[PDB]
Swiss-Prot record, chain A:
Subunit structure: Component of the 40S small ribosomal subunit.
Functional note: Component of the small ribosomal subunit. The ribosome is a large ribonucleoprotein complex responsible for the synthesis of proteins in the cell.
Family: Belongs to the universal ribosomal protein uS14 family.
Taxon lineage: Eukaryota, Metazoa, Chordata, Craniata, Vertebrata
Omega-N-methylarginine modification, residue list: 11
Record's protein name: Small ribosomal subunit protein uS14
Residues bound to Zn(2+): 20, 23, 38, 41
This protein's encoding gene: RPS29
GO CC field: cytosolic ribosome; cytosolic small ribosomal subunit; rough endoplasmic reticulum
Swiss-Prot record, chain D:
The name this protein goes by in its record: Small ribosomal subunit protein uS19
Keywords: Acetylation, Cytoplasm, Isopeptide bond, Ribonucleoprotein, Ribosomal protein, Ubl conjugation
GO molecular function, one term: RNA binding
Gene behind the chain: RPS15
Organism: Oryctolagus cuniculus (Rabbit)
Subcellular location as annotated: Cytoplasm
Glycyl lysine isopeptide (Lys-Gly) (interchain with G-Cter in SUMO2), cross-linked positions: 97
Major location category of this protein: cytoplasm
Curated annotation (Swiss-Prot), chain E:
Post-translational modification remark: Polyubiquitinated by ZNF598 via 'Lys-63'-linked ubiquitin chains when a ribosome has stalled, initiating the ribosome quality control (RQC) pathway to degrade the potentially detrimental aberrant nascent polypeptide. Deubiquitinated by OTUD3 and USP21, antagonizing ZNF598 activity.
Major location category of this protein: cytoplasm
Protein's organism: Oryctolagus cuniculus
Subcellular location: Cytoplasm
GO BP of this protein: translation
The name this protein goes by in its record: Small ribosomal subunit protein uS10
Gene encoding the protein: RPS20
Full-sequence range covered: 18 to 117 of 119
Record key words, sorted: Acetylation, Cytoplasm, Isopeptide bond, Phosphoprotein, Ribonucleoprotein, Ribosomal protein, Ubl conjugation
KW Lyase (keyword) present: no
Function per UniProt: Component of the small ribosomal subunit. The ribosome is a large ribonucleoprotein complex responsible for the synthesis of proteins in the cell.
Post-translational modification Phosphoserine, affected residues: 76
Curated annotation (Swiss-Prot), chain F:
UniProt-annotated stretches for the region Disordered: 1-13
Positions bearing the Glycyl lysine isopeptide (Lys-Gly) (interchain with G-Cter in ubiquitin) cross-link: 25, 31
Organism, scientific name: Oryctolagus cuniculus (Rabbit)
Modification type N6-acetyllysine: residues: 22, 31
Zinc finger (C4-type): 39-62
Protein name listed in UniProt: Small ribosomal subunit protein eS31
Portion of the full sequence shown: 83 to 150 of 156
Entry function: Component of the 40S subunit of the ribosome. Part of the small subunit (SSU) processome, first precursor of the small eukaryotic ribosomal subunit. During the assembly of the SSU processome in the nucleolus, many ribosome biogenesis factors, an RNA chaperone and ribosomal proteins associate with the nascent pre-rRNA and work in concert to generate RNA folding, modifications, rearrangements and cleavage as well as targeted degradation of pre-ribosomal RNA by the RNA exosome.
Quaternary structure note: Part of the 40S ribosomal subunit. Part of the small subunit (SSU) processome, composed of more than 70 proteins and the RNA chaperone small nucleolar RNA (snoRNA) U3.
Subcellular location: Cytoplasm; Nucleus, Nucleolus
Post-translational modifications reported in the UniProt record: Monoubiquitinated at Lys-25 and Lys-31 by RNF25 in response to ribosome collisions (ribosome stalling): ubiquitination promotes subsequent activation of RNF14, leading to EEF1A1 ubiquitination and degradation and rescue of stalled ribosomes. Deubiquitination at Lys-31 by USP16 is required for maturation of the 40S ribosomal complex.
Tree of life domain: Eukaryota
Length: 55, 112, 96, 120, 100, 68
RNA sequence: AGCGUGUGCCUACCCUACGCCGGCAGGCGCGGGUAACCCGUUGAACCCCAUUCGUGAUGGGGAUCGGGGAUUGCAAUUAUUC
RNA sequence: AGGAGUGGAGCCUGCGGCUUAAUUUGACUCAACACGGGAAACCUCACCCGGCCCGGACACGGACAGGAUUGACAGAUUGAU
């Protein structure tokens, strides 16, 4: 029963159901407004998104 | 994502920038480079390949995406192209002081 | 590999008609977003064209999660004399 | 000499009743657990666990059956049964007394050793 | 036919340029044009730490986006205002057409 | 890494030589016979064969088990 | 009162007026919002007024602990939470 | 000059130490200690006890359609159909 017990674990909810869409890590995710990455990747690619640190 | 795309392929082409312009039921992506003959490839093979992969990756309709490749004016004023030129100069194997002095002097007579 | 014969040739004429390939990197995707008519995962697809990389017929570069396999002229010859086609049908990357 | 009574009913009375009223005979969490759904999605292990418990040794000490399921609520039908449940390292072989009802197998297998400090 | 057009963008100066050009065009086309309704702008504030690891003085960024939305109302048939709205659109300014 | 526990091995499958002649049996006359029973399923049709065990009858890929 | 946020790609998981049942935690058919329109005029708290308390480990303080009932999740026991 | 405090009381969280089969680890004056956006029931997980699969490509030599191999239900088994 390798096929039916290989990934029968439900990852429907929880932290590991989502991941970073830049580098695929599961720590420090930003889910607000659907960015779906960690803080470092947003800080590195924040200029081309259009977010400016005016304040 | 399109910016990191085009700097992954067009590193040897001397990449500088990207522009996206919106049209009703049509997507326009303008590619800014310096080797405007090497970006097409032989008979426009590679730009058609890039159009096909961006259309299949981003869920775009068939026959609505096209790529225009126009080279940038004032080559010595875009810092990205000089950075990739210095990267390919140091990658082939050459003294770092000669290469940095050459890029510094080229930016200096280029009008900056 | 435990791949059926139909899946390998299926990715083969999908690559032969259009010489481009995009796939998101995950092993638990039950059906391809393009090949949902039949049953094939992405893991078969990446391991098959990784074998094609190791035999030396395609190029490769990686985005965030998306692979990008490109076709070569010797790859066109290999797919031509593997899928047993007459040499007048061309991939769409060359003909305009 | 004392006779055990649970909620006003006797042991054989508890055996010869069903889950549809046994949920109200249980507490709040156990009613929610048994009324959640069918024991099929992950508790086919529980199905075959009560099957292996329903396997009957003869009139002696019953044979021990061991499992990794720490989330098993003690039904009245499995009183007087011999079981060892996994705490992560070994199996603590425990006698099911007629008092287990309303608990888990994790209530009766300790994980941490009781600490005995020495010198800092 | 009552028609509503929305001028939503990220930059504000090109927004003022295209809204002034659209109002001027509706003025010279002899059409009843309403004034530009300025909606309250929305500020995109998300804050994060500076350093990638966990050491240092606890310092934070304040990244900001401002999106401005404008409303122009007209009383006109469909094809003429399609001809007007499909003229000289900026890449940083998004226009969307709605009909009541 | 060799440990104190003994090493387990996988199935080295027993090799059978020309088992197809044990599917049919041929006589001295001109007829063809079926020694074992044929599975009556639709996709598990008229090509495959089915076992002969000591207590049960089981097929190959359609998994229909029959016993007395 | 004021900053806000709100139906998400693989990704399913949104914010909620209104009616009934129940002390309550909560439950069902019902309507809006992909948002200055709907929650919403965000009837917020501290404060204000009127009783009860009277220097007492007290009606201060709510730690520890027993019993019971709902919600989330495939799963709560080393009590998820209420 | 002052105000509000902390340090004393109960509780939450983090660090050291002790126990453990594991109690994963980085950081130790400002500039480590509600820090790693680290509010861990499963994933997270990188620590311990157990068992599967290859997801070991490509090239060489055996092997081989007379068979290279894959999948599986009576019943024991561990943990599981």
């Amino acid at each position: 029963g390798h096929q039916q017990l290989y990934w029968s674990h439900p990852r429907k909810f929880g932290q590991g159901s989502r991941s970073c869409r830049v580098c695929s890590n599961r720590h420090g995710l930003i889910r607000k407004y659907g960015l779906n990455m960690c803080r470092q990747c947003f800080r590195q690619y924040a200029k081309d998104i259009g977010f400016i640190k005016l304040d | 994502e399109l910016n990191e795309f085009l700097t992954r392929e067009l590193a040897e082409d001397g990449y500088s920038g990207v522009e996206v312009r919106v049209t009703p039921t049509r997507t326009e992506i303008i590619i800014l480079a310096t080797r405007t003959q090497n970006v097409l490839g032989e008979k426009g093979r590679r730009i058609r390949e890039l159009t096909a992969v961006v259309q299949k990756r981003f869920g775009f309709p068939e026959g609505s995406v096209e790529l225009y490749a126009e080279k940038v004016a004032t080559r010595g004023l875009c810092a990205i192209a000089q950075a990739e030129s210095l990267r390919y100069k140091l990658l082939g194997g050459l003294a770092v002081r000669r290469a940095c002095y050459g890029v510094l002097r080229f930016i200096m007579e280029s009008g900056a | 590999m435990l791949m059926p014969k139909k899946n390998r040739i299926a990715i083969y004429e999908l690559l032969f008609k259009e010489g481009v390939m995009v796939a998101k990197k995950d092993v638990h995707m039950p059906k391809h977003p393009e090949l949902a008519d039949k049953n094939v995962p992405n893991l078969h697809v990446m391991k098959a064209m990784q074998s094609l990389k190791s035999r030396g017929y395609v190029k490769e570069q990686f985005a965030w999660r998306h692979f990008y396999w490109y076709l070569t002229n010797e790859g066109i010859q290999y797919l031509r004399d593997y899928l047993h086609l007459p040499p007048e049908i061309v991939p769409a990357t060359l003909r305009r | 000499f004392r006779k055990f009574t649970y909620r006003g009913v006797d042991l054989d009375q508890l055996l010869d009743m069903s889950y549809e009223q046994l949920m109200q005979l249980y507490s709040a969490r156990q009613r929610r657990r048994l009324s959640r759904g069918l024991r099929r999605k992950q508790h086919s292990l529980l199905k075959r666990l009560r099957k292996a418990k329903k396997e009957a040794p003869p009139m002696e000490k019953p044979e021990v059956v061991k499992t990794h399921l720490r989330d098993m609520i003690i039904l009245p039908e499995m009183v007087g049964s011999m079981v060892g449940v996994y705490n992560g390292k070994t199996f603590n072989q425990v006698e099911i007394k007629p008092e287990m009802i309303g608990h888990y197998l994790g209530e009766f297998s300790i994980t941490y050793k009781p600490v005995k400090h020495g010198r800092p | 036919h009552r028609i509503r057009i929305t001028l939503t963008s990220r930059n504000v100066k090109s927004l003022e340029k295209v809204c002034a050009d659209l109002i001027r065009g509706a003025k010279e086309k002899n059409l009843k044009v309403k004034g530009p309704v300025r909606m309250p702008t929305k500020t995109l504030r998300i804050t994060t730490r500076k350093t990638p690891c966990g050491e240092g003085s606890k310092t934070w960024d304040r990244f900001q986006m401002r999106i401005h939305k404008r409303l122009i109302d007209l009383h006109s048939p469909s094809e003429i205002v399609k001809q007007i709205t499909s003229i000289s659109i900026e890449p940083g300014v998004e226009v969307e057409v709605t009909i009541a | 890494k060799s440990y104190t526990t003994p090493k387990k091995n996988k199935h080295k499958r027993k090799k059978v030589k020309l088992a197809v002649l044990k599917y049919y049996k041929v006589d001295e006359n001109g007829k063809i016979s079926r020694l074992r029973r044929e599975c009556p399923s639709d996709e598990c049709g008229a090509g495959v064969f089915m076992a002969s065990h000591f207590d049960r009858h089981y097929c190959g890929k359609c998994c229909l088990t029959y016993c007395f």
